[PDB]
Amino acid sequence: SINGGIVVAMTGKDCVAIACDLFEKIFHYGHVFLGITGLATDVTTLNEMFRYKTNLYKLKEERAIEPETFTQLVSSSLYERRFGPYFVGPVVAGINSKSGKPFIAGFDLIGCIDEAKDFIVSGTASDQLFGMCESLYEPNLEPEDLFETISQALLNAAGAVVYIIKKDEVVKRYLK
Amino acid sequence: DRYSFSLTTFSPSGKLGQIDYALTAVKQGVTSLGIKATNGVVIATEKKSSSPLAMSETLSKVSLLTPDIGAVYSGMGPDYRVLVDKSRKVAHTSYKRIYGEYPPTKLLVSEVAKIMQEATQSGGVRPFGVSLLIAGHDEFNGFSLYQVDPSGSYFPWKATAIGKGSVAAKTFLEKRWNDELELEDAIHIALLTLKESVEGEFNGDTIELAIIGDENPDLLGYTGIPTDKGPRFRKLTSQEINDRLEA
Amino acid sequence: PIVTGTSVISMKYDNGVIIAADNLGSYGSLLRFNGVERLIPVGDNTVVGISGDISDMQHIERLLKDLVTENAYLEPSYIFEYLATVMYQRRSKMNPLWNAIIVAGVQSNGDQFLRYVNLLGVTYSSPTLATGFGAHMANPLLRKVVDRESDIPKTTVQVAEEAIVNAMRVLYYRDARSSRNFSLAIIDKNTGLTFKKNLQVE
Amino acid sequence: MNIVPQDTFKSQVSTDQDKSVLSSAVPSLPDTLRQQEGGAVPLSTQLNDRHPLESTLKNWETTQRQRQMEQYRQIFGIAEPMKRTMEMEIVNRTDFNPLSTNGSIHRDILLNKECSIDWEDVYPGTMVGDDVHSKIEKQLGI
Amino acid sequence: IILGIRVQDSVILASSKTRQLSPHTLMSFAGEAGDTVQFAEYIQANIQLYSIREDYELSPQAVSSFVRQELAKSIRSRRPYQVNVLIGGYDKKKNKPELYQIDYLGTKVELPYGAHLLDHHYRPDMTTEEGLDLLKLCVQELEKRMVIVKIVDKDGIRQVDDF
Amino acid sequence: AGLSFDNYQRNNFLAENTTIVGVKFNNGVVIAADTRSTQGPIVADKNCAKLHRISPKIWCAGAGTAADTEAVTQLIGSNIELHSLYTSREPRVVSALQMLKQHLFKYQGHIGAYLIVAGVDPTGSHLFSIHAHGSTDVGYYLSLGSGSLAAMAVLESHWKQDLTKEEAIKLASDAIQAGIWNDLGSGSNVDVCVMEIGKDAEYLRNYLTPSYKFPRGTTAVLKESIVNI
Amino acid sequence: MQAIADSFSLVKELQYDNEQNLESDFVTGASQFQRLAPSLTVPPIASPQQFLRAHTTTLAFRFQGGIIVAKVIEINPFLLGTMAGGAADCQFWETWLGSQCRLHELREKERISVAAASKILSNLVYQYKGAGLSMGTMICGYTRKEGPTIYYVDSDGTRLKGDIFCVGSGQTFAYGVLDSNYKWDLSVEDALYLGKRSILAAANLYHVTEDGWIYHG
Amino acid sequence: FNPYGDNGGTILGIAGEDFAVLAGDTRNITDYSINSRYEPKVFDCGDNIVMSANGFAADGDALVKRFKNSVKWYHFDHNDKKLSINSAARNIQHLLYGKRFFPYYVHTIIAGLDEDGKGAVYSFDPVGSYEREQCRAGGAAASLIMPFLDNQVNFKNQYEPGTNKKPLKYLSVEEVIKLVRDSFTSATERHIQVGDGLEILIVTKDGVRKEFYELKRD
Amino acid sequence: GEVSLGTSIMAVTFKDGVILGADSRTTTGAYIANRVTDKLTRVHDKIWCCRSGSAADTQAIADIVQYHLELYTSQYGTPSTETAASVFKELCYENKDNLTAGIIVAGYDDKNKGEVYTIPLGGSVHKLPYAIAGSGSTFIYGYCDKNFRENMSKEETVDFIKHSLSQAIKWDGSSGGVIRMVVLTAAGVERLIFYPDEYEQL
Amino acid sequence: GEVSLGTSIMAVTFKDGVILGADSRTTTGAYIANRVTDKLTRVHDKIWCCRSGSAADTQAIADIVQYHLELYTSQYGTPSTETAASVFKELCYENKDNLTAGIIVAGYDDKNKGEVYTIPLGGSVHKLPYAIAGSGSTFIYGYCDKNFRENMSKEETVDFIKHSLSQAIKWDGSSGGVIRMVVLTAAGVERLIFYPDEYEQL
């Protein structure tokens, strides 16, 4: 089944990583990347909704949404369906265009914000990957050391894709 | 009774009469003006009072819309007050409650313009008899100054003035404005323009002036969140205004 | 459980152990029976404090008097082991004793003894033990006096006693089933067992 | 004189209860194309196992308003609720705007909601029947 | 039962019903009686209204997106009815077949084949004759485990008596 | 409008398939909280900041459904901001309490936010608790969360009338430490906010704070591509 | 205004403020007997369906001369309906359907298509689907354009067309005996014979013609 | 009446070449309340056998007391013969399955040496399936403990850098002890139940050694 | 798990007016969430009430009553206690299916010189010389019925309320803390408080 | 639907012995099945008990007790009231899972000069100066606690029991009828009865 699976995001120096075990579950709205686990119907509905919202944002502001503002947009859009939520675990990752601050966040079904600075995991096998990330993770990884850390952690969580995000470029990679 | 005919309509000339008459009501209002500096914006106006027994400290013609955005008006004060209330409410509801941050000045101006425009379509209400100068700062658009007219049209300005003195003030600004003003220079030019525009007693209690500037952490009211930003809108006290006038 | 006993609190100190109980049996919300003594000294060197069902309390108190009467033909550890075994076998019989029990005392070698047991047979030691509501409110206060087993030699009997009285005061403030009257026992390796009846929160 | 909305369930149901969306071919059944609800499949019988809160949260404000009018009738007499209601209906009936979703600026003043937000303000929440003409026809009752 | 195969030239669909959404787009569906057919016919009426208004066929991807959206909107108000839909269409703009499946929750996925075995048989380069042979094989294995047949093509939709 | 119900029946069908304290003192009130956050047994985020701001001098901390406490707290902070602007007055803590309890009452307890609201206003210092059903009680000291019993035990053992600012901060941080040590849900750092009747509120983030990296090339890259945006 | 005032001016307790109640009890005229789509009372509770729950053989086939069908509600002189399921629900909804048909024929000045009539029926039954209305009406007729036409309609809202329908307790015996003989090119009295034989194998005749249905006893 | 509870805490068996490690946290839990910070969760059973019945504490104590008594009887009957680790495992299997319809609500691990002197670890289902294993975590944070160790003692999903598997290594007993240390440190950092201290039993051909290490008290 | 006002409340008419007294404990199960809560709620200057049942519904009701009565006072001058009781009755009754509230209303009113109304959970209203309610009232029905007298002095009524509420506190776990009283008379409103050391030693 | 002894029973020790009193109503729901039932049950000449809970289980228990105590008396002479209470305790406790019985035991015994034991539903035993039980006891806890005195005379204790049981009858629907009392003293056993016209006009 294509429902569920796992998404993880992780912070480096001047970079972030986001990865999932794969239909697709990582989306991007300009320079802000949203990973969503859960029901694939709800993943698709969230993708359509946040595409709508961020397109209207970009049209009204003449400006691409910043990851912190997109995080607040995701939070408020999830809470709107406080009763009968989407069965999803979204994760946002990105870098602020002005400050270059690498940013990650993750949410519950109703948009509580973790905003943890080190790493965020969601979905199936979350406690296994929490243990992996805690053990493997070290702060201030280089972009390629960050790639190795995220990709190895994901492979040991249980066919994967990795985005390495710089301020000015993004590298997309795949894993068996 | 299910319908009410539109109160605002085009004349055979193609001009919407009630819009022209609202702009005339604006022309009748007391002078107000605003000036972009490189490092701030000034907005100023006369506190005309119907009596010396009135409390000038209650004639709040300049009002905060957001910590980074302020408004002034000429014309029907009650309409301005209702528009300020609605603009604050929409700044919270439409934007702060969605994105967790205050709107940029451009979008709050657009929201005020939308509110003012719809009074021009309704068959139940007249248009608002006010034009607003809205000055503000945005993290990306920087300092900005907009003039909103009774039609709900708005344009960005480097400096402008509205009301009785509007034309003479706009000429004084056009000769005296330059792209290098500091906020203290803009404040001085604003005070000189209003001195030239005001009628009768010109003192720190017959004027009020607000600025958009750097953050004021002493106006934030709390300490210990170092990323958190003091308000950039600041009304000058009549003491400070008098200390400017002694220049 | 019909008539229930409120809560037992206890801590060990440099020379001994202190245990306290609020001498009250509640009939649901009705504070029906006062003067229900819930601290049961079992010879000179141990006190068994019992909480929960007062009828089961009086059955375990007679099991303990039976134990003493047979031994007359004890260490705290032996009384505990017997109690824990009874409790666990009653659990496995699906016929639990609805009680939580702390066996406090001093071993003949002079080691302080504190063990908790409940109707499940769950057991643990600690520098401080409390049952029921005392486990949430009293234990935080006693653990401020002896947080770790290296604090035991630092803690005088006067300070342990004042801490126990303060914790009983806090329980009386914040436990709706607490009485103002309570009993306190001090088991000291040097001075033996001191059992202060009918203390009052003040 | 109610705090929680009491009267909150339909006492009678019919295929024709929903007006303005009826089949022109057979004026007894809904128009499932014009409903645009995803077919007939939202049959009216499926109005079952509603969330316990929904039937009270939808009409909470209406109940508060009715209590307020009742209090004004008890204390001030029939004149005050009549005046309030007449004002409110004048506002509602003269504000026609098919493009705006926003509430009237004067409606908020009458409701004393000038300095109040609710989730209905924050979260104000189609191939057929969305047109301006459908709103004109609803409002005039064409 | 419903079944479909995307071939190099055509989409092949089979079922133990179906609605033609457009000359180059076909819908097949399975699920609860009434709910499923009322849904399918509301969908058909919508796609026909679009096609009339624009005088242009909606692409198979847009059709499947519309069906996904309408199914999700159908569920929101009521208990989810069991339904599954295969949409087979020839995209006359990209000039290639497309097959979409939509589950009872409105989960939509593009599939090479689906139903509501072939991994040992299915090849993307097959011709519609090979596809019809693979369909025959699949039905033979189905009758071992215990149809109307349609083709979608440059020349539209076709009935096949070789069931 | 409002909070949607639009997947209630859907999600039903599919399902068929902390320590916080407030401490009033002689000229103010201190509120403090731990900064652990947990999902199930798992620490979702250490150093989570639990002290919310309703107004410059009205601060809040909550338990129950975190998203609910956040949403209601930010809604009431918006209403308090707008009301302060409308009345040109520094907002009262009793006004926040009133509108917060009327909001929670409107939702009949289905919005599961339990809160301690502390603040200073022109009428003095105030400290309140609010429950998800909309019931309130005033106090001189309060505790909330899974560690509420341990913190209340500390407050009741050490609280006294006419605490000083420093003594009150000490008491509050001791009660949070007792929570951290005695409750599993509490842990990591202690946050404190101090409001004095004449003074700006002093927020004190983390007032108390009680290699395996693989060589490059370890992971089997399958292929690479550039995504641009 | 005065209307507003009179809203604030004993009738609340017995709910004779409610207009639909006044109509139901025939206070505000006979209007309850002046509405198409009769209004049905539902219990004012969170689970009406729970409160509600807590409360023959016939044949048809198409042939050269029309259809023979072998409790057949005379919906119209050109439409027949096999009452099946709850007799009350059948009698009521078939009478309502006959009235809808009469209105259609009046407005459009044509005999209704049997397809149209069966669709109207299935749509209404679907709209009440899940609340009572046990229903199995087989709809039979002849129209100059359509010719002989058969549609079954179900409580579940199924609608299905076919050359033969066998329903009821002996349906499998009737179907087996018929398929041993059925043809399109039957002669009229030959089709009557085959029909009677197939009913007798499952132990009324109605002959359906362009000029209406005929009963052969 | 529910005859079971969850007392939290965690256990970890690692088999070496000439050693086996059994580690467990010492914190005892009920609900969100700490019952004690030092219960010995792992036990020397004699005959160079170390045991821990993780799960419901009372059933673990019962099972380990029945096992120790069975060992006493094994010695009485067989004149102090060393119980073999396989015979110990079979004993514990029969002790467990005797509860088949009222099981000990525990996952239990024994560590020892086999007749070769090779490191041995066995783990048993509460109804007494068992396997010889090289390593096994158990308890609430087992999912945190194990994958790290499966990434540090084994090298699974690692490759020689750019040579798109790196070979596994034998580890000294102190090096695996240090890896247990680091693993439990990470788990107490991220799982609230992982105790205030880590106690490690080292089985060697010389006998059993006990080691204790402090962990964070929150 | 809503907050319910476990309580002992007691209003008594006397020669000069009415005294309304209450305990000050509130409980969440066995936990005392506040041990010094003020249960006496002013709805008007000389009109006071005590609340029982859920804290949320009773607080909402009492706030709506205070609104209604302030509006009334602004229109007609000071209401009678019968007016207030009528408003309480209407709110309790028309929401009876949704809200569980029981109210003792006490108030002074110079035409009536002090009145007491009790509104039990059903939303009946009964004027009485005195009323007792809450969990702890059950234990003192016989005491109040034997010891109550018409036209007591102020001091006699204060003594009577102290002895009654002290016995309610003695027997009920859900009530305790300080005793609080308001005295309502033509002279004004007087707050009174009695501490455990002033009423337990009775 | 078993018969439960809805009841107000009250035993009081006094200077010469003990008085045990009861109402005489028994109810099946709202129906009074017998309005003059004698709830006082002799288990020995000077040892009497009152029964509460189910009528069948308590009657079986009391008959087994009377058997056991007659056998005892035949072997050792007259039992003490503590013996009888022990037998009651053992029967109530070892059948506690099957039988619901609560007993007040009163008896005179020349070494002890009158004793009272109450055995609540749990099967605890508590010696008391006086005991009250049954539905109607709840309404008179405050009265008995305020008005009871140690070493009352016979006449004072009869008055006290009359006033208490009359208030219990007043407030409890499940208790009523005549009040019956036995006076147990060294002088013998004396039956007393008080009719409604003798205790309602109090």
UniProtKB/Swiss-Prot annotation, chain A:
This is Proteasome subunit beta type-3. Belongs to the peptidase T1B family. GO terms for molecular function: endopeptidase activator activity. One of its GO terms (biological process) is proteasome-mediated ubiquitin-dependent protein catabolic process. Signal peptide: none annotated. The 26S proteasome consists of a 20S proteasome core and two 19S regulatory subunits. The 20S proteasome core is composed of 28 subunits that are arranged in four stacked rings, resulting in a barrel-shaped structure. The two end rings are each formed by seven alpha subunits, and the two central rings are each formed by seven beta subunits. The catalytic chamber with the active sites is on the inside of the barrel. There is a cross-link at residue 53 (Glycyl lysine isopeptide (Lys-Gly) (interchain with G-Cter in ubiquitin)). It is found in: Cytoplasm; Nucleus. Non-catalytic component of the proteasome which degrades poly-ubiquitinated proteins in the cytoplasm and in the nucleus. It is essential for the regulated turnover of proteins and for the removal of misfolded proteins. The proteasome is a multicatalytic proteinase complex that is characterized by its ability to cleave peptides with Arg, Phe, Tyr, Leu, and Glu adjacent to the leaving group at neutral or slightly basic pH. It has an ATP-dependent proteolytic activity. This subunit may participate in the trypsin-like activity of the enzyme complex. Keywords: Cytoplasm, Isopeptide bond, Nucleus, Phosphoprotein, Proteasome, Ubl conjugation. Its main location: cytoplasm.
Curated annotation (Swiss-Prot), chain C:
It comes from the Eukaryota. GO terms for biological process: proteasomal ubiquitin-independent protein catabolic process; proteasome assembly; proteasome-mediated ubiquitin-dependent protein catabolic process. It is found in: Cytoplasm; Nucleus. Keywords: Cytoplasm, Nucleus, Proteasome. One of its GO terms (cellular component) is cytosol. Coiled coil: none annotated. Signal peptide: none annotated. Its main location: cytoplasm. Disulfide bonds: none annotated. Present with 16900 molecules/cell in log phase SD medium. Non-catalytic component of the proteasome which degrades poly-ubiquitinated proteins in the cytoplasm and in the nucleus. It is essential for the regulated turnover of proteins and for the removal of misfolded proteins. The proteasome is a multicatalytic proteinase complex that is characterized by its ability to cleave peptides with Arg, Phe, Tyr, Leu, and Glu adjacent to the leaving group at neutral or slightly basic pH. It has an ATP-dependent proteolytic activity. PRE3 and PRE4 are necessary for the peptidyl-glutamyl-peptide-hydrolyzing activity. Belongs to the peptidase T1B family. This is Proteasome subunit beta type-7. The chain holds residues 37 to 248 of 266 of the full protein.
UniProtKB/Swiss-Prot annotation, chain D:
It holds the Pfam family UMP1. It comes from the Eukaryota. Keywords: Chaperone. Residues 1-35 are annotated as: Disordered. One of its GO terms (biological process) is DNA damage response. Seems to be degraded by the proteasome upon its formation. InterPro entries: Ump1. One of its GO terms (cellular component) is nucleus. The keyword Phosphoprotein does not apply. The keyword rRNA processing does not apply. Residues 8-26 have a biased composition (Polar residues). Present with 2740 molecules/cell in log phase SD medium. Belongs to the POMP/UMP1 family. Short-lived chaperone present in the precursor form of the 20S proteasome and absent in the mature complex. Required for the correct assembly and enzymatic activation of the proteasome. Also prevents premature processing of the PRE2 propeptide. This is Proteasome maturation factor UMP1.
Swiss-Prot record, chains I, J:
GO terms for biological process: proteasomal ubiquitin-independent protein catabolic process; proteasome-mediated ubiquitin-dependent protein catabolic process. It holds the Pfam family Proteasome. Keywords: Acetylation, Cytoplasm, Hydrolase, Nucleus, Protease, Proteasome, Threonine protease, Zymogen. GO terms for molecular function: endopeptidase activity; threonine-type endopeptidase activity. Its EC number is 3.4.25.1. It catalyses: Cleavage of peptide bonds with very broad specificity. Its main location: cytoplasm. The active site is at 7 (nucleophile). One of its GO terms (cellular component) is cytosol. It is found in: Cytoplasm; Nucleus. The 26S proteasome consists of a 20S proteasome core and two 19S regulatory subunits. The 20S proteasome core is composed of 28 subunits that are arranged in four stacked rings, resulting in a barrel-shaped structure. The two end rings are each formed by seven alpha subunits, and the two central rings are each formed by seven beta subunits. The catalytic chamber with the active sites is on the inside of the barrel. PANTHER family: ATP-DEPENDENT PROTEASE SUBUNIT HSLV (PTHR32194:SF0), METALLOPROTEASE TLDD (PTHR32194). Belongs to the peptidase T1B family. The side chain of Thr-7 acts as a nucleophile, and the N-terminal amino group acts as a proton acceptor. Present with 7250 molecules/cell in log phase SD medium. This is Proteasome subunit beta type-1. It comes from Saccharomyces cerevisiae (strain ATCC 204508 / S288c) (Baker's yeast). The gene is PRE3.
